[PDB]
Amino acid sequence: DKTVRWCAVSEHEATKCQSFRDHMKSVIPSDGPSVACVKKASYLDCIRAIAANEADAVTLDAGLVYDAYLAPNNLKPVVAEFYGSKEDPQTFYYAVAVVKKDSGFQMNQLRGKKSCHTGLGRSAGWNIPIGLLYCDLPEPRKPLEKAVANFFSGSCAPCADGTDFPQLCQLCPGCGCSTLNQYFGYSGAFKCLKDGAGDVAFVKHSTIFENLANKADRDQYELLCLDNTRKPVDEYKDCHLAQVPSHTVVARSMGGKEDLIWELLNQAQEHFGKDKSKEFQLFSSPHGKDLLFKDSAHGFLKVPPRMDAKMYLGYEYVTAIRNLREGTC
Ligand SMILES: [Fe+3]
């Protein structure tokens, strides 16, 4: 079988997936890999669809690769994004806290603010900033959601349960887990800050550059540094919360079609990759940012075949995510 069933998360992704499928048909020979689109309501539905042999591939933030590995889904990373450039491929990025200039507060003054997160469980939007915060609370509210809900004065945490924790959806009611939620993802969390809904956006170092083309506009923003100071958004290298690994395509650990997923993706970056074509762009869309893959990605690299999720993420990140979810301090 030469079809890779790609899992698209809701409507904008499904639109781009269809364009992906149709543009690959225009350049890959008829005996080559083809794209079929499967649409689901959230990454987690895609994880389950893949484990159940209803879909083959989906791209996940590395924090979500954790959930993807857990039994009984047992998926594995097979193809990783890289950032930066072909010339120096980065398989990491920086988690940063973006704030508006002249809002005055520092990192130790986040209590009571309104917070914009990319989504529950994601590296920059959640695992890093909450992972740094949780234990350092004097309060054992500590199985996360309730503790974060009380610490901030209202949030948008896409994919959180708004019935159980309404505070975490105050800025984005329903906490929708797809780009139909306008405050989902890196650029949704940035808009949440830009719009004045929240006081801080937990996103990545490219995010503000993806959204504000003009240096004068960007000058109205700053980064919160862990030593309770602020720096210009250009100085993320010296002012970030953490470095985290690349988003990656996951697949079944057995019968995953990983070899065919690589073939589809490699041939796709060849024809429609970074600045390759004006007919189609793997890495951007008129339909939204970060659909199917990150806009900030410049291409794909194959994951070594021995490497399971825990090896991909590494010991410190797997341990932190495990500890963060158990509230162990
Ligand atoms: Fe991410």
Swiss-Prot record:
Cellular localisation: Secreted
Disulfide bonds: C7-C46, C17-C37, C116-C192, C135-C329, C156-C172, C159-C177, C169-C175, C225-C239
One cellular-component annotation, GO: endoplasmic reticulum lumen
UniProt tissue specificity: Expressed by the liver and secreted in plasma.
Primary location class: secreted
Residue ranges constituting the Transferrin-like domain according to the UniProt record: 4-326
Binding residue positions for Fe(3+) 1: D61, Y93, Y186, H247
Glycosylation (residues): S30
Dimethylated arginine found at: R21
Molecular function as annotated in GO: enzyme binding; ferric iron binding; ferrous iron binding; iron chaperone activity; transferrin receptor binding; transmembrane transporter binding
Entry binding sites for hydrogencarbonate 1: T118, R122, A124, G125
Outcome after substituting D275G: In allele TF*D1
Keyword presence, Glycoprotein: yes
Keywords: Disease variant, Disulfide bond, Glycoprotein, Ion transport, Iron, Iron transport, Metal-binding, Methylation, Phosphoprotein, Repeat, Secreted, Signal, Transport
GO biological-process terms attached to the record: antibacterial humoral response; cellular response to iron ion; intracellular iron ion homeostasis; iron ion transport; multicellular organismal-level iron ion homeostasis; osteoclast differentiation; positive regulation of proteasomal ubiquitin-dependent protein catabolic process; positive regulation of receptor-mediated endocytosis
Superkingdom of the organism of origin: Eukaryota
Family listed: Belongs to the transferrin family.
Description of how the protein assembles with itself and partners: Monomer. Part of a complex composed of SLC40A1/ferroportin, TF/transferrin and HEPH/hephaestin that transfers iron from cells to transferrin.
Protein role: Transferrins are iron binding transport proteins which can bind two Fe(3+) ions in association with the binding of an anion, usually bicarbonate. It is responsible for the transport of iron from sites of absorption and heme degradation to those of storage and utilization. Serum transferrin may also have a further role in stimulating cell proliferation. (Microbial infection) Serves as an iron source for Neisseria species, which capture the protein and extract its iron for their own use.
Disease: Atransferrinemia: A rare autosomal recessive disorder characterized by abnormal synthesis of transferrin leading to iron overload and microcytic hypochromic anemia.
Domain notes: Has a bilobed structure, each lobe binds a single Fe(3+) ion. Does not always bind 2 Fe(3+) ions.
Name recorded for this polypeptide: Serotransferrin
Organism, scientific name: Homo sapiens (Human)
